[PDB]
Amino acid sequence: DPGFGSLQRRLLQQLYGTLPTDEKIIFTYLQDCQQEIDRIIKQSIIQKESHSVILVGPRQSYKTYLLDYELSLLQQSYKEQFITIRLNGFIHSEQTAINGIATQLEQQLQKIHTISSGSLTEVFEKILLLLDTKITVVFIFDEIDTFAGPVRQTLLYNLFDMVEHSRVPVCIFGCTTKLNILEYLEKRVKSRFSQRVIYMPQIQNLDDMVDAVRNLLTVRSEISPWVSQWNETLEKELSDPRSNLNRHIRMNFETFRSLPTLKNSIIPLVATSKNFGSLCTAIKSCSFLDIYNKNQLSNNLTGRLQSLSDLELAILISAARVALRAKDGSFNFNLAYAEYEKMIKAINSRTIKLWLKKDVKNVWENLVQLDFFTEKSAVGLRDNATAAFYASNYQFQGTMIPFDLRSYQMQIILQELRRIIPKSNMYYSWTQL
Amino acid sequence: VIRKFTKKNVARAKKKYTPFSKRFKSIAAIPDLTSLPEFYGNSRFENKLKTTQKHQIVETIFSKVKKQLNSSYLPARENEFASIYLSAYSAIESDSATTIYVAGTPGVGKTLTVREVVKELLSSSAQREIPDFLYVEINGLKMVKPTDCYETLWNKVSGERLTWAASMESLEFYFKRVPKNKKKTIVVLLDELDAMVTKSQDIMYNFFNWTTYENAKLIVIAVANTMDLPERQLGNKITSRIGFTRIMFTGYTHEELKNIIDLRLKGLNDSFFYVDTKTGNAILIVRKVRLRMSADAIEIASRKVASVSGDARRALKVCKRAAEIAEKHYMAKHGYGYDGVQTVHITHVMKALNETLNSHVITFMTRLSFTAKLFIYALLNLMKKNGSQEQELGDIVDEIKLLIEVNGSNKFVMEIAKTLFQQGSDNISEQLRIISWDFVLNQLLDAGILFKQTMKNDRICCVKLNISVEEAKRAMNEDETLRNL
Amino acid sequence: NVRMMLRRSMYKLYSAADAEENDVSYDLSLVENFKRLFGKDLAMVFNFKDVDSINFNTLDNFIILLKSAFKYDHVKISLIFNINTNLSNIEKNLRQSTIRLLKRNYHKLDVSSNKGF
Amino acid sequence: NVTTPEVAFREYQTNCLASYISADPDITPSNLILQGYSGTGKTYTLKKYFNANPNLHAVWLEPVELVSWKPLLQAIARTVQYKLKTLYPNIPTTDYDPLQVEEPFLLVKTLHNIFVQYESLQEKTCLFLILDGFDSLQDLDAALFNKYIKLNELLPKDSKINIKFIYTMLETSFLQRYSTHCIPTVMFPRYNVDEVSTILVMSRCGELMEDS
Amino acid sequence: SMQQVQHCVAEVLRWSSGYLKKLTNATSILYNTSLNKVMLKQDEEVARCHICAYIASQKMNEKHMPDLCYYIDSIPLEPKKAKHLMNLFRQSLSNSSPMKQFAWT
Amino acid sequence: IEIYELEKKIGLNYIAKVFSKFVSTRTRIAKLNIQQKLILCTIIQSLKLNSDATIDESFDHYIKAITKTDTLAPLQRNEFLEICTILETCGLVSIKKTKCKGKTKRFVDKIDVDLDMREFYDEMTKISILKPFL
Numbered sequence A: 001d002p003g004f005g006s007l008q009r010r011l012l013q014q015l016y017g018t019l020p021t022d023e024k025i026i027f028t029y030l031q032d033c034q035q036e037i038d039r040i041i042k043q044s045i046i047q048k049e050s051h052s053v054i055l056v057g058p059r060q061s062y063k064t065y066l067l068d069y070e071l072s073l074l075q076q077s078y079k080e081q082f083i084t085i086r087l088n089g090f091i092h093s094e095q096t097a098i099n100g101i102a103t104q105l106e107q108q109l110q111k112i113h114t115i116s117s118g119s120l121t122e123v124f125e126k127i128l129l130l131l132d133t134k135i136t137v138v139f140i141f142d143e144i145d146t147f148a149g150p151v152r153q154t155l156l157y158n159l160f161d162m163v164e165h166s167r168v169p170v171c172i173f174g175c176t177t178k179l180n181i182l183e184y185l186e187k188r189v190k191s192r193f194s195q196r197v198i199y200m201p202q203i204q205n206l207d208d209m210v211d212a213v214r215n216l217l218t219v220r221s222e223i224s225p226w227v228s229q230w231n232e233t234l235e236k237e238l239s240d241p242r243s244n245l246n247r248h249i250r251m252n253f254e255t256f257r258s259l260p261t262l263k264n265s266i267i268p269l270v271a272t273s274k275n276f277g278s279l280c281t282a283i284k285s286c287s288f289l290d291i292y293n294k295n296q297l298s299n300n301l302t303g304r305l306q307s308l309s310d311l312e313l314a315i316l317i318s319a320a321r322v323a324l325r326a327k328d329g330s331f332n333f334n335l336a337y338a339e340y341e342k343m344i345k346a347i348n349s350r351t352i353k354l355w356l357k358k359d360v361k362n363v364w365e366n367l368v369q370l371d372f373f374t375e376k377s378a379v380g381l382r383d384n385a386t387a388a389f390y391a392s393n394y395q396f397q398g399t400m401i402p403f404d405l406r407s408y409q410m411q412i413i414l415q416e417l418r419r420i421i422p423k424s425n426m427y428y429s430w431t432q433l
Numbered sequence B: 001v002i003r004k005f006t007k008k009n010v011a012r013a014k015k016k017y018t019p020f021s022k023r024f025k026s027i028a029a030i031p032d033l034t035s036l037p038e039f040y041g042n043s044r045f046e047n048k049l050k051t052t053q054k055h056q057i058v059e060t061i062f063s064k065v066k067k068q069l070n071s072s073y074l075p076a077r078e079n080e081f082a083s084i085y086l087s088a089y090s091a092i093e094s095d096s097a098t099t100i101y102v103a104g105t106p107g108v109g110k111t112l113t114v115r116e117v118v119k120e121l122l123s124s125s126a127q128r129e130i131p132d133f134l135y136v137e138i139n140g141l142k143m144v145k146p147t148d149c150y151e152t153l154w155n156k157v158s159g160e161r162l163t164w165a166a167s168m169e170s171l172e173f174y175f176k177r178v179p180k181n182k183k184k185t186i187v188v189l190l191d192e193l194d195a196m197v198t199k200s201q202d203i204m205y206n207f208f209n210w211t212t213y214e215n216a217k218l219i220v221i222a223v224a225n226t227m228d229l230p231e232r233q234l235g236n237k238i239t240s241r242i243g244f245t246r247i248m249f250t251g252y253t254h255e256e257l258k259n260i261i262d263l264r265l266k267g268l269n270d271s272f273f274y275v276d277t278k279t280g281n282a283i284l285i286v287r288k289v290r291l292r293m294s295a296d297a298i299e300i301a302s303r304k305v306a307s308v309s310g311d312a313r314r315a316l317k318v319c320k321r322a323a324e325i326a327e328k329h330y331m332a333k334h335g336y337g338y339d340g341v342q343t344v345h346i347t348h349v350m351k352a353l354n355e356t357l358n359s360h361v362i363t364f365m366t367r368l369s370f371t372a373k374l375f376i377y378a379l380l381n382l383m384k385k386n387g388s389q390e391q392e393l394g395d396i397v398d399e400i401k402l403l404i405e406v407n408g409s410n411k412f413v414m415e416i417a418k419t420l421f422q423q424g425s426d427n428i429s430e431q432l433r434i435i436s437w438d439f440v441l442n443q444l445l446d447a448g449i450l451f452k453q454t455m456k457n458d459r460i461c462c463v464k465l466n467i468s469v470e471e472a473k474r475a476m477n478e479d480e481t482l483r484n485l
Numbered sequence C: 001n002v003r004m005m006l007r008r009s010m011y012k013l014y015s016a017a018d019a020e021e022n023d024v025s026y027d028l029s030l031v032e033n034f035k036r037l038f039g040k041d042l043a044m045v046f047n048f049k050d051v052d053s054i055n056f057n058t059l060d061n062f063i064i065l066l067k068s069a070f071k072y073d074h075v076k077i078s079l080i081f082n083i084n085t086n087l088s089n090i091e092k093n094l095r096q097s098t099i100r101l102l103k104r105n106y107h108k109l110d111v112s113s114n115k116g117f
Numbered sequence D: 001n002v003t004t005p006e007v008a009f010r011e012y013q014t015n016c017l018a019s020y021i022s023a024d025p026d027i028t029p030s031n032l033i034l035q036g037y038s039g040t041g042k043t044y045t046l047k048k049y050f051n052a053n054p055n056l057h058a059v060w061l062e063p064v065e066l067v068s069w070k071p072l073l074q075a076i077a078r079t080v081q082y083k084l085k086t087l088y089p090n091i092p093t094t095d096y097d098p099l100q101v102e103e104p105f106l107l108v109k110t111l112h113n114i115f116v117q118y119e120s121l122q123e124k125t126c127l128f129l130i131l132d133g134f135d136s137l138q139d140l141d142a143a144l145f146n147k148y149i150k151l152n153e154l155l156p157k158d159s160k161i162n163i164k165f166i167y168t169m170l171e172t173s174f175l176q177r178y179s180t181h182c183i184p185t186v187m188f189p190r191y192n193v194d195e196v197s198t199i200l201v202m203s204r205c206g207e208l209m210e211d212s
Numbered sequence E: 001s002m003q004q005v006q007h008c009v010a011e012v013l014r015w016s017s018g019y020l021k022k023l024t025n026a027t028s029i030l031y032n033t034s035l036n037k038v039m040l041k042q043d044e045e046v047a048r049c050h051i052c053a054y055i056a057s058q059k060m061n062e063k064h065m066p067d068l069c070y071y072i073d074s075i076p077l078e079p080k081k082a083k084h085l086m087n088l089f090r091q092s093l094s095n096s097s098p099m100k101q102f103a104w105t
Numbered sequence F: 001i002e003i004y005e006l007e008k009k010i011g012l013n014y015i016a017k018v019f020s021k022f023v024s025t026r027t028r029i030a031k032l033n034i035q036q037k038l039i040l041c042t043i044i045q046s047l048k049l050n051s052d053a054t055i056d057e058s059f060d061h062y063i064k065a066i067t068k069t070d071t072l073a074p075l076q077r078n079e080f081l082e083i084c085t086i087l088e089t090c091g092l093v094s095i096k097k098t099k100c101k102g103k104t105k106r107f108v109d110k111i112d113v114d115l116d117m118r119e120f121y122d123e124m125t126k127i128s129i130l131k132p133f134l
């Protein structure tokens, strides 16, 4: 059935957003904000007016999506009128952004018709001579908050000076998740900034999510013979308020309120269907969404507890008992083994094997590996590479004492252990202190 | 030869190492540097950003207004101008070396006044009342390294390209040992002086100690943020050498900002334009349309900006934003695309001024999901009971569980408890965290609403509110469910 | 740390291989491409001086890091542990998976000055 | 156009791999995560999936060997161009040195310079980079994975070679640090006792029988 | 500040009654909005509330009682300066949301 | 000499002109309205209790002081930071960005005051409605 293959490919590329520019999907709650972006681009590329603007919104809130849509829409009619320089706050540092801007300037200027040669002082001086009809330079500057540090903000200073005073028209689109982005800026940088902040729209009601799902899953072109029947199946499942798809949209609205989150589950529902009737049954039932939701929680604390052996569960209950009785919540191997040994004698007195410390050591190491115990006052994963490098050159005191004396703390407490251990388990009576 | 690491991206400038002190036999053998071709300055990139235009772009009535209010394109700076011009003129005429300290808040016209003083001095030197001088401008924030100033100034003096230490000794020898009849006066503007402050203060001491030399003929105009920058960040030697007579650039009053904006809009306010009604293109002297921007709107914008900052950039940007809002409404109502009286009203000015005053924190928290609001609400309850301002995440988990299990007769909670704890599904076990727990935790950390401690234990890691508590409560008081319980 | 151990080991390996038979990254990918760069195969003998004074977490992580070279067909690795106290001190500082890894081919050799007079 | 293999207790994971991995870059995610603890069949399922589909172009890297971020970048730069030479031997190429990469933007520039010389190809294809054990890096920090999520955005959209990243993770907390990025994740839960018994029998009886 | 608002509207015009209470409430709301939105020099501040009271009075004459009379003379400033500041206040705070949600009736 | 030839022997008055030109919290307070004096009272009161308090914690104190007094309409957080910027311009407030020193260490913006406390209480006790806010 090549028609179902065509319909499945079309549904997948609608869900990945990789349609052509004239066919690309903009949601209703995203129109006006897009139109605002559509003004600023068109005031820079076409009318040669310099702009600086920061888009503020959470992750996966269609900032990059709307910016790429605007650049691709203006790319097909005004191609020689602008160049694009992309910087990212994660990849580019404060010193490597100059080289990134320079090499992007050569690979963009020859694409229409040197800067990046020499030392950093020479390259920055040549950039300042180049920037400080005319071709509009458009800066897309993601994670702008990483360059608004509390020490010195040289690149933001120079770029906003390029917006303010240069004879070359410059458009800067910063993007961030920080709501209070204007307080991050230094006073002179804040003075040179245009104070134009666009906050991305949030989903306000369930009808916005249902309308966006309808936009994502309706085939508005006739490239398969199965398109029409799929459209009435989708409209029947979306217009029914008591359907499974509306229930899953409502669950996403209350918990995540994220259309990429829903798309990551809808994509393997479409892709794993083999024919048209299987796809219709899958979208009517949405049982694959339940299987997806079960798999997304399979490596959490509950699913990791349900994979434990009897001795592992016994040692974990013993360590939780010792941690609940302790005031700092701290324990070691010796106290947990004492609690385990007392528990096994009190079970066998009313058989169950007592394992020796030599064999309980491996169980303890697996429990540390499965993130049930943490080392006491452990920082863990560091935020940046410099702090991790400093941590790698220091010998911690926990790594020099024997393992039976290392202090540990519980990731799950005994009250949480009693809730999800079944009452038919043989160690269930020891989950209450 | 096997190398322990490689540096395969070395970019080394072609700058020489021999300083100026070793290129002549003696002090008496140095020739007249004024009569030298490379000395004292005696653009190749401008062609690269030009293209051919094949569309007649439509400039409306407000386009000339918005181009007019740009900072790139002095009624209120006449005493600062007089002081700086008198000091610099007296130092040029008497072959003296001096320091002029200027400081102020952003956008109060410091750089503009210094550049106008320098242009008027060049005009005076063109008609021969003062000896000829070189002008050098060094911005501390446009330097990759702070020592590049040493590389810059000497390159403006001799035309040579040296390394920074060799340039520093070259400048030292030139200022100290070269006689005044053999050299030329140099006026150097040090802009953004706080960026030239290092840990050892080498550059600051060198630049303000060269001004104390007899043979230097060096005038340094140092532009800074504050009056007490030497008394805070510099030693007593540099503070002594800078001096005591320091020039304040105070913020503009509302009359001065109003005069600046009216001097921008002098030729186009209350004027007439030829506007083609089919397209909207406006031509200064088909409908004759009269353009005005009201003086009351400009006045109150000047009053607000003058009370806040005195920033001329802020006043110009507020007026430009009001013109942009009026132009957006005009192009919306007239159906004008991109290829009888038009008034920039006071409501547009008040829309421009309030746009940076409306807070999207409460609006952002109002439109969050139920689980993020439940997180914030439980955190507020913990701050109410134990009063810590930092709450453990396990305490938030147990407080969320308690708030669910106590209000178990609330209809919304009855409808949503299976969603929070099983994702609406059988075959999914009772979970220890709610659904989208780390999702809303990372969402509130991304927005800057929360601060999270760097620990690897998820329960005793603490979380602090980064915003004020009453706006969080306010946002929690808008919701119909969290109001009830 | 483990990174310095690997970098010193791979610099020593590359220096010896060039000293007998363009530079590479001092990293375990040199073990991967050793036959492609030198033609012969490889036998590494690791001698750990003063194991009682080393950080046993760092040594343990280096042992699991060296375990990753078993999937390459041309690699043989020998380890020599110079122990000064006894084996019961070093079997309680390593993890049990490391002990199970080291048990498949190991030889004790009690060589000292008091051995048999 | 994907063959779905048969893994004995990883049917959902194999179906998810068939759903997410394809030769079309138009319907393939930029980033894909396979999260599971040790001995859960992540590597086994990924090898069976790529062995059942030989048209998929995969580059296998082990970050546990690479130890730090700089040899990981150099390994990406070396192995991508080696695979591209062994994939299209009739394309004239310039051999860029992988040791030129000391910073992530240098990786972006090197990948751009490698990919612009394959524009004579007819169809857009995917190059899959499997970082099997990303959080097993001994010099790991929280900011490193953020540089790899956004790496496709600094690469040209209209390229014939479109790089796709497949990550493998061990710890749940490391994955849950990046939950708001909404990367598609397939999770590999730990086997139960009957499953590990069956796997042990069908993986070890053949060499227990033929022992000397 | 209730005594100040009462004194200013008493000087402008000529207390639980409906029209006088609504006039004082409107004058208080304009005063509270005026302290933040319109920024006054030291002398002109002394005549703030009078101006606020004045425009409140004008609104009543606009609707709800065309017979109510008011005299600008009670503002202590120069009458040109007082009228100009009154024009600024009236144009700036007529379109405010508290007086878009107010109940003049 | 510069002052003499800018206004046009040199006497005592020009030396005093230099020393007054190139070199006060009573006059700064007197140039404020009743809303800005109210904010400056709650800022100093919030800094006695904490002395390491952010702008959000200073705004936190100001809302509680209004609700027990009901003097002037309560205003928003960004309107509060604007008045703090007005008092920044006047010199009564000195806003810095420094790192907090709790369990979670990040960079926060906090209010510092350095005005003369002897002249602050004299200017505020003349106004009757501000005396609850001392």
Ligand SMILES: Nc1ncnc2c1ncn2[C@@H]1O[C@H](COP(=O)(O)OP(=O)(O)OP(=O)(O)O)[C@@H](O)[C@H]1O
Pocket (backbone or CB within 6 Å): A016, A017, A018, A057, A058, A059, A060, A061, A062, A063, A064, A065, A066, A068, A069, A142, A176, A177, A260, A263, D181
């Ligand atoms: N160029 C693009 N073409 C198609 N879809 C895209 C494009 N860029 C992003 N998307 C999709 O948009 C959704 C999320 O939007 P987007 O990536 O723009 O968010 P964002 O707010 O910019 O994110 P962040 O803060 O993480 O940078 C995802 O489903 C993603 O796949």
Ligand SMILES: Nc1ncnc2c1ncn2[C@@H]1O[C@H](COP(=O)(O)OP(=O)(O)OP(=O)(O)O)[C@@H](O)[C@H]1O
Pocket (backbone or CB within 6 Å): A188, A191, B070, B071, B072, B073, B074, B075, B076, B077, B104, B105, B106, B107, B108, B109, B110, B111, B112, B113, B260, B312, B313
């Ligand atoms: N007196 C003035 N007359 C006209 N325009 C002015 C005046 N002062 C400032 N401006 C405008 O404000 C802009 C900013 O002024 P300027 O660059 O001199 O500020 P600054 O005081 O040096 O501030 P910063 O500390 O941020 O460098 C000028 O480019 C000009 O457009």
Ligand SMILES: Nc1ncnc2c1ncn2[C@@H]1O[C@H](COP(=O)(O)OP(=O)(O)OP(=O)(O)O)[C@@H](O)[C@H]1O
Pocket (backbone or CB within 6 Å): D007, D008, D009, D010, D036, D037, D038, D039, D040, D041, D042, D043, D044, D045, D170, D199, D203
């Ligand atoms: N489903 C299975 N069917 C058959 N054999 C299996 C299966 N799962 C695992 N195995 C066997 O167990 C071995 C371990 O699996 P694998 O290497 O894929 O684990 P992993 O989860 O990737 O581990 P790690 O995180 O430690 O690298 C496989 O190499 C294979 O021999």
Ligand SMILES: [Mg+2]
Pocket (backbone or CB within 6 Å): A063, A064, A142, A175
């Ligand atoms: Mg983005």
Ligand SMILES: [Mg+2]
Pocket (backbone or CB within 6 Å): B110, B111, B191
């Ligand atoms: Mg300046």
Ligand SMILES: [Mg+2]
Pocket (backbone or CB within 6 Å): D042, D043, D132
């Ligand atoms: Mg593996």
